[PDB]
Design an enzyme around this catalytic site. Structure first.
Site, mmCIF file in Angstrom:
data_model
loop_
_atom_site.group_PDB
_atom_site.id
_atom_site.type_symbol
_atom_site.label_atom_id
_atom_site.label_comp_id
_atom_site.label_asym_id
_atom_site.label_seq_id
_atom_site.Cartn_x
_atom_site.Cartn_y
_atom_site.Cartn_z
ATOM 1 N N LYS B 111 0.625 -1.300 0.100
ATOM 2 C CA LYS B 111 -0.008 -0.214 0.011
ATOM 3 C C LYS B 111 0.966 1.314 0.031
ATOM 4 O O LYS B 111 1.976 1.389 0.616
ATOM 5 C CB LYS B 111 -0.971 0.006 1.152
ATOM 6 C CG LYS B 111 -0.653 0.070 2.491
ATOM 7 C CD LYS B 111 -1.887 0.120 3.571
ATOM 8 C CE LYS B 111 -1.571 0.155 4.805
ATOM 9 N NZ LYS B 111 -0.717 -1.015 5.563
ATOM 10 N N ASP B 237 -8.864 3.899 16.338
ATOM 11 C CA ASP B 237 -9.715 3.761 15.198
ATOM 12 C C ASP B 237 -9.158 2.958 14.228
ATOM 13 O O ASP B 237 -9.556 2.944 13.007
ATOM 14 C CB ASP B 237 -9.572 5.210 14.706
ATOM 15 C CG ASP B 237 -10.460 6.074 15.514
ATOM 16 O OD1 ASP B 237 -10.108 6.657 16.465
ATOM 17 O OD2 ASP B 237 -11.567 6.485 14.913
HETATM 18 N N1 LIG Z 1 -6.173 -8.246 1.817
HETATM 19 C C1 LIG Z 1 -6.040 -7.118 2.778
HETATM 20 N N2 LIG Z 1 -4.872 -7.365 3.370
HETATM 21 C C2 LIG Z 1 -4.428 -6.243 4.202
HETATM 22 N N3 LIG Z 1 -4.775 -5.217 4.231
HETATM 23 C C3 LIG Z 1 -6.011 -4.998 3.542
HETATM 24 C C4 LIG Z 1 -6.512 -6.045 2.856
HETATM 25 N N4 LIG Z 1 -7.694 -5.267 2.061
HETATM 26 C C5 LIG Z 1 -7.723 -3.936 2.445
HETATM 27 N N5 LIG Z 1 -6.741 -3.953 3.541
HETATM 28 C C6 LIG Z 1 -6.555 -2.719 4.286
HETATM 29 O O1 LIG Z 1 -7.563 -2.496 5.214
HETATM 30 C C7 LIG Z 1 -8.362 -1.306 5.403
HETATM 31 C C8 LIG Z 1 -9.447 -1.223 4.691
HETATM 32 O O2 LIG Z 1 -9.334 -1.582 3.331
HETATM 33 P P1 LIG Z 1 -10.897 -1.733 2.430
HETATM 34 O O3 LIG Z 1 -11.128 -3.102 1.919
HETATM 35 O O4 LIG Z 1 -10.636 -0.876 1.199
HETATM 36 O O5 LIG Z 1 -11.777 -1.153 3.346
HETATM 37 C C9 LIG Z 1 -7.293 -0.415 4.539
HETATM 38 O O6 LIG Z 1 -6.225 -0.186 5.629
HETATM 39 C C10 LIG Z 1 -6.535 -1.347 3.415
HETATM 40 O O7 LIG Z 1 -5.310 -0.856 2.918
#
Ligand SMILES: Nc1ncnc2c1ncn2[C@@H]1O[C@H](COP(=O)(O)O)[C@@H](O)[C@H]1O
Ligand SMILES: Nc1ncnc2c1ncn2[C@@H]1O[C@H](COP(=O)(O)O)[C@@H](O)[C@H]1O
Ligand SMILES: Nc1ncnc2c1ncn2[C@@H]1O[C@H](COP(=O)(O)O)[C@@H](O)[C@H]1O
Ligand SMILES: Nc1ncnc2c1ncn2[C@@H]1O[C@H](COP(=O)(O)O)[C@@H](O)[C@H]1O
Lengths: 301, 318
Positions: B111, B237
């Protein structure tokens, strides 16, 4: 199999790091169908700034620049040198004692000047085309790579060639050949570098000469078309018997590694191995050629 | 064996170039008995200018910085990741997806982050390491593998590499983000194929994750350590990322997939898919869950957040 880059001076470590890095980088570069004009004006430059990291043998800051890496890699191939071996010889252990050899004695590493690198750029295209045309067989120096090291703000240029001498067979006397002879101090050195006069005097000579001569000719003709001169024929002499005084037979050698080596003929007084190649083409010439070309022909058979 | 570093965004090519380059240099750097305090302020920096050379895929000019490489190598070890594997996942083929990437094999997440994020990593890094040591790598926290700064066309880009919370093989059919008020999926979000649902969705659809008692305890014990650790660092958070895999639905999807071409099931190596849990043999549906804390980097406080955050998840499970 962990390459520390331990060496006497840091510049040698940087050199080791450098050859390692660039050869590895090249292994990801496709071998192209032909060299191109930009290949001769190309370089790789890398700058390193390592804070609190990996400074046991390497400086934390240094620069490493490789000139015309596609061209020199092609030259390596045309000289029958495998990149991974070239890399290992530089990299597996520090080079040994500006003029060095790799620890395995296969390659020589010569410090040179700004203008030398200029002169090399000047001749590179032609030199290359000639190595092509002569199918790699030649007595000229074999340029394997050229680099600029930046260490402590100081730039240092280096050229890697194939060692003229065997890497195993001990050399017993050295002649520089183009009026001139050996100095006292030198004449009092473990391995003295004699010159033309010390040779005709020593009546020193015994072979191949047919193919050495037709080879050497094309060379000097080439060096004339480049209007270069003042270069020597480095000659090496290994006295088989002397060296003698789980085996490694006397006078035994791999002609594919010791490329400049010739054994003595039968009818030769003492059993010897000779090493001969042209050295230092980098820094009347059209006459230097014909002159050089004959002074040498009188030292064979 | 030739790696071309081919990738849509030169930025990605450079990422591949850099992970490759650094991992190999590390291979020539002995493994220390312990980390030293400087290792936590350490960095490598390389600047490349390749004139008229080697530019099929890489820019001629770029910079690659790796933060605290000694610390991240060791973290990789503690997490049971081999450096060659890691290197291979980033470099064998371009990352898939810019802001949020997966390696082509779905093992690792990459990321893009802010400078602030990078600063917060340093702040918390000595402690985070220590914590990873005393829990033997057993944690719901994000598992940090690498931190990097790329420069392409004079533009700086920060990246953190983590282990994927999700399986690299098993499909997710429903995900959640949970905190502990007034949270839920927007009308736009739901429009997505895989919507990211939130707290009042999870509750208003009456969901429960059936993992059974032995797992539930092992999980809540982790969560408890993790969230307290996060408290002591005054951190707030963060979410619990929750993924759900429907075994039967997937088996059918697979079937359908083969039929297209023509013209085990619910199994996971707990050493790779590190956050995954089988549903109890008494669940209504055969499922696999993935649960991990996400977003550690970036009205009450941390002590309260930990307590609250904690009691919610506790209820999510059976
Ligand atoms: N497969 C994954 N592994 C690790 N972190 C994730 C993954 N998918 C999303 N994130 C992280 O989790 C948070 C929420 O992601 P989202 O699924 O876009 O809401 C953000 O910090 C993303 O960068
Ligand atoms: N052992 C060696 N192998 C290959 N070339 C050499 C060697 N020693 C000297 N030379 C070359 O010979 C020149 C100097 O020779 P000299 O000063 O006559 O000993 C330099 O250009 C060197 O590159
Ligand atoms: N060793 C360090 N300790 C704390 N913060 C750092 C450190 N290195 C970088 N940062 C922070 O990371 C952000 C970007 O760093 P950089 O771009 O490497 O200088 C800035 O906010 C820095 O202050
Ligand atoms: N074994 C099955 N279990 C559940 N749904 C199925 C199954 N086979 C087919 N379907 C569903 O029935 C519809 C027709 O499937 P198909 O047979 O592939 O045309 C599709 O929506 C499938 O997803």
């Amino acid at each position: 199999k962990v390459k520390l880059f331990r060496a006497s001076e840091p510049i040698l470590s940087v050199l080791m790091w450098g050859v390692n890095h660039t050869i590895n980088e090249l292994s990801n570069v496709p071998v192209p169908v032909m060299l191109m004009p930009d290949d001769f004006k190309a370089y790789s430059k890398i700058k390193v700034d390592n804070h609190l990291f990996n400074k046991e043998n390497l400086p934390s800051r240094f620069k490493f620049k490789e000139y015309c890496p596609m061209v020199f890699r092609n030259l390596r191939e045309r000289f029958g040198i495998d990149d991974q071996d070239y890399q290992n010889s530089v990299t597996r252990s520090a080079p040994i004692n500006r003029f060095l050899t790799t620890y395995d004695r296969r390659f020589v590493i010569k410090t040179v000047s700004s203008e030398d690198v200029a002169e090399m750029h000047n001749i590179l295209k032609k030199y290359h085309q000639f190595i092509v045309e002569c199918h790699g067989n030649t007595l000229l120096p074999q340029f394997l790579g050229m680099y600029r090291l930046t260490v402590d703000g100081v730039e240092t240029y280096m050229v890697v060639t194939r060692n003229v001498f065997s890497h195993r067979l001990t050399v017993h006397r050295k002649y520089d050949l183009k009026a001139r002879e050996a100095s006292d101090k030198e004449k009092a050195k473990d391995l003295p570098t004699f010159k033309d006069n010390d040779f005709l005097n020593e009546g020193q000579k015994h072979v191949s000469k047919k193919n050495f001569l037709e080879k050497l000719k094309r060379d000097v003709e080439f060096l004339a078309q480049l209007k270069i001169m003042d270069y020597s024929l480095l000659v090496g002499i290994h006295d088989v018997d002397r060296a003698e005084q789980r085996f490694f037979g006397p006078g035994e050698f791999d002609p594919s590694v010791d490329v400049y080596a010739m054994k003595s003929h039968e009818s030769s007084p003492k059993k010897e191995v000779y090493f001969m190649a042209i050295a230092d083409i980098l820094t009347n010439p059209e006459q230097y050629s014909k002159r050089f070309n004959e002074f040498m022909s009188n030292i064979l058979t």
